[PDB]
Amino acid sequence: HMPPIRRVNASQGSDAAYQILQEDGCVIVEQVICPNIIAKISDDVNRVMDKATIGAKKGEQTHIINMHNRTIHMGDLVLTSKTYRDELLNLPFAHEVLEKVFKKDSGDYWLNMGNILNMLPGAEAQRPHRDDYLYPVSQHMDPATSPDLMINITFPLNEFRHDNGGTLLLPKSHTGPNADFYANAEDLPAAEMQVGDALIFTGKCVHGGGANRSDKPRIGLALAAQPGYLTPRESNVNVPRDIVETMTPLAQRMIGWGTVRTKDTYGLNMLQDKDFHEALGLKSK
Amino acid sequence: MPPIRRVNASQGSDAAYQILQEDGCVIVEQVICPNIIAKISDDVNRVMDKATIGAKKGEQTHIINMHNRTIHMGDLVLTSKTYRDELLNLPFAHEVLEKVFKKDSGDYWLNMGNILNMLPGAEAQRPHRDDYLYPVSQHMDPATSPDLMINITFPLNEFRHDNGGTLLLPKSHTGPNADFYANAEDLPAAEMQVGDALIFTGKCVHGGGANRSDKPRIGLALAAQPGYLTPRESNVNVPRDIVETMTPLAQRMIGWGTVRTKDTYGLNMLQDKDFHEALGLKSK
Numbered sequence: 204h205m206p207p208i209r210r211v212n213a214s215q216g217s218d219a220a221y222q223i224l225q226e227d228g229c230v231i232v233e234q235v236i237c238p239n240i241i242a243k244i245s246d247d248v249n250r251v252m253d254k255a256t257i258g259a260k261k262g263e264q265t266h267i268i269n270m271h272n273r274t275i276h277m278g279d280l281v282l283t284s285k286t287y288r289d290e291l292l293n294l295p296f297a298h299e300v301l302e303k304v305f306k307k308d309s310g311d312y313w314l315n316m317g318n319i320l321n322m323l324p325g326a327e328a329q330r331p332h333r334d335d336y337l338y339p340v341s342q343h344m345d346p347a348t349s350p351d352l353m354i355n356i357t358f359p360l361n362e363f364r365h366d367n368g369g370t371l372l373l374p375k376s377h378t379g380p381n382a383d384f385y386a387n388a389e390d391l392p393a394a395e396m397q398v399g400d401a402l403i404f405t406g407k408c409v410h411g412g413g414a415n416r417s418d419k420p421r422i423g424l425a426l427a428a429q430p431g432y433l434t435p436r437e438s439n440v441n442v443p444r445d446i447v448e449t450m451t452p453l454a455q456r457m458i459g460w461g462t463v464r465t466k467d468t469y470g471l472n473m474l475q476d477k478d479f480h481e482a483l484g485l486k487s488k
Numbered sequence: 489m490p491p492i493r494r495v496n497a498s499q500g501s502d503a504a505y506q507i508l509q510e511d512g513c514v515i516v517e518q519v520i521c522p523n524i525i526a527k528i529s530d531d532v533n534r535v536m537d538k539a540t541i542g543a544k545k546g547e548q549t550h551i552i553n554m555h556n557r558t559i560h561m562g563d564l565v566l567t568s569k570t571y572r573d574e575l576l577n578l579p580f581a582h583e584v585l586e587k588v589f590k591k592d593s594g595d596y597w598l599n600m601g602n603i604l605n606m607l608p609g610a611e612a613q614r615p616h617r618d619d620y621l622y623p624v625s626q627h628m629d630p631a632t633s634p635d636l637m638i639n640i641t642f643p644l645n646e647f648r649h650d651n652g653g654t655l656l657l658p659k660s661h662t663g664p665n666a667d668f669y670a671n672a673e674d675l676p677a678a679e680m681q682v683g684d685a686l687i688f689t690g691k692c693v694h695g696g697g698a699n700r701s702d703k704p705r706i707g708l709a710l711a712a713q714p715g716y717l718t719p720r721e722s723n724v725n726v727p728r729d730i731v732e733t734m735t736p737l738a739q740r741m742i743g744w745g746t747v748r749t750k751d752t753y754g755l756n757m758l759q760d761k762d763f764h765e766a767l768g769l770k771s772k
């Protein structure tokens with residue numbers, strides 16, 4: 204028995220989606236965001252896609268997830284899309300789920316990064332994996348009882364179906380032991396969703412990019428968050444301060460322009476022994 | 489009770505590392521020219537009165553017994569050029585840190601540099617493990633888990649038992665995490681001179697001692713950790729022109745650089761590239 208990927212409408216509330224996430228490691232939330240906001244971000248991303256790196260980043264081994272040259276991953280979204288900074292980073296449903304995930308075990312959270320996922324036509328499926336492999340301490344903790352190190356929220360920017368490589372998932376695989384092999388991609392169900400929906404899954408849920416056998420790119424946007432005590436993959440220190448001060452204090456923290464407190468109350472990312480905002484006199488919306 | 493073992497830096501970083509692996513702590517004598525420490529001490533004294541006393545805003549105090557007769561002070565990059573140029577590049581220290589972190593974790597960088605000023609009358613701290621700062625430490629077995637922190641403390645004046653030199657429990661770095669390790673009254677003190685350094689891991693039981701003398705006892709803690717752990721102190725307010733006078737290693741140490749895990753994956757990247765490549769960050 205291969206468990207199905209379960210779904211809720213965001214009208215049912217964040218408690219119900221969190222419950223499915225706790226039981227399965229993954230949940231699809233239908234109609235979580237106005238599709239026109241997503242289409243706007245999609246246009247911004249399409250404007251600059253010719254700038255992104257194809258395949259591997261410099262020096263990064265590819266064999267763990269099967270990173271290959273029919274895939275484009277692209278960061279730098281804060282400067283690419285104002286709609287991303289102001290609308291997506293502040294989406295209340297997402298923050299309700301993330302606070303439920305992180306606050307007790309870990310404390311404040313922020314982004315690992317925001318990442319465009321472009322599977323080009325003919326893209327081969329990835330090796331099903333756990334995203335928390337990024338952080339080596341995940342290999343020293345029991346998955347059944349350890350805190351979650353990551354939550355991925357993927358918004359399709361065009362329709363996701365099995366045939367165009369929509370994310371493959373292995374529901375209820377988030378409590379088993381860490382392993383070097385979990386499944387073959389061909390045995391997993393795909394997340395099939397429309398623009399305005401989102402897929403949420405934990406850093407322990409087995410998953411991977413699907414095979415794109417259509418003739419059009421399949422593009423999603425991954426809002427990936429983690430405890431503040433883990434180092435983001437993407438820094439935002441090159442974002443002009445004038446632009447940071449048009450963001451809310453929450454979105455500022457998400458992109459690393461803020462102090463993050465552990466569940467024990469201890470501050471990280473402080474400046475001159477004080478709060479980040481206080482030490483800079485940093486303004487916000 | 490095992491003693492705190494010691495080596496001279498002339499015996500090489502391998503011997504210091506071996507003692508660190510066996511005991512969780514080691515004193516390295518004459519690891520740095522005392523003139524350098526004296527300069528940094530001048531820099532710090534010139535700005536000590538602007539430091540915060542006791543707990544920082546909203547941080548509970550009871551795990552380590554933080555109290556209002558101890559001054560902890562950061563912001564060392566901008567305080568001391570000698571700190572930026574000499575101390576952050578000390579080769580013995582980086583040899584030890586590479587031995588600790590490279591295989592299990594990857595690149596490392598500062599948790600922070602922190603002046604530890606213990607005024608006369610300061611009570612001893614509750615003996616503790618520093619890695620409690622990172623909640624993941626409580627979910628890993630100390631006997632086999634990676635080290636999450638290395639502390640290198642340079643006395644800025646003489647450390648002695650009577651003036652609150654750091655109390656240590658040697659060989660305590662492999663036992664299970666616990667809510668009580670020892671009473672401070674039962675632990676030996678790190679006693680050493682300017683130019684020496686005490687190294688101990690995030691798993692070594694230790695604490696501030698009681699300063700029963702008439703003068704402050706002041707150390708400089710250089711605390712390092714895996715690049716995948718968020719530093720306590722950010723340095724994004726340091727002017728880029730100051731940063732470009734530093735070495736690439738010291739730049740990475742203060743967070744102006746990409747840090748790769750032992751699996752080759754980069755963290756603290758900029759615009760999908762290496763930090764330096766994306767900014768054209770120059771260095772010495």
Ligand SMILES: CC1=C2O[C@@]3(C)CC[C@H]4C(C)(C)C(=O)C=C[C@]4(C)[C@H]3C[C@]2(C)C2=C(C(=O)OC2)C1=O
Binds near residue numbers: 265316
């Ligand atoms: C585990 C492993 C990786 O860690 C993960 C999964 C963790 C976070 C993840 C998020 C969820 C943010 C995303 O949007 C999609 C991919 C990344 C960026 C990813 C990239 C990275 C470093 C990588 C690897 C490789 O081969 O090239 C790239 C790799 O094996």
Ligand SMILES: CC1=C2O[C@@]3(C)CC[C@H]4C(C)(C)C(=O)C=C[C@]4(C)[C@H]3C[C@]2(C)C2=C(C(=O)OC2)C1=O
Binds near residue numbers: 548549
């Ligand atoms: C665990 C615990 C903390 O974590 C540690 C130990 C971890 C690293 C450490 C280093 C080695 C850098 C140092 O130089 C001296 C003190 C700190 C800054 C410290 C401060 C902090 C947040 C704290 C606590 C408290 O009560 O007030 C303050 C506390 O209990």
Ligand SMILES: O=C(O)CCC(=O)C(=O)O
Binds near residue numbers: 320321
């Ligand atoms: O593109 C997808 O649907 C999944 C991408 C993924 O899992 C990854 O690269 O880590």
Ligand SMILES: O=C(O)CCC(=O)C(=O)O
Binds near residue numbers: 655
């Ligand atoms: O001052 C000392 O010797 C130790 C300080 C310490 O251990 C701490 O505050 O965590």
Ligand SMILES: [Fe+3]
Binds near residue numbers: 410411
């Ligand atoms: Fe993944």
Ligand SMILES: [Fe+3]
Binds near residue numbers: 552617694695
């Ligand atoms: Fe300590």
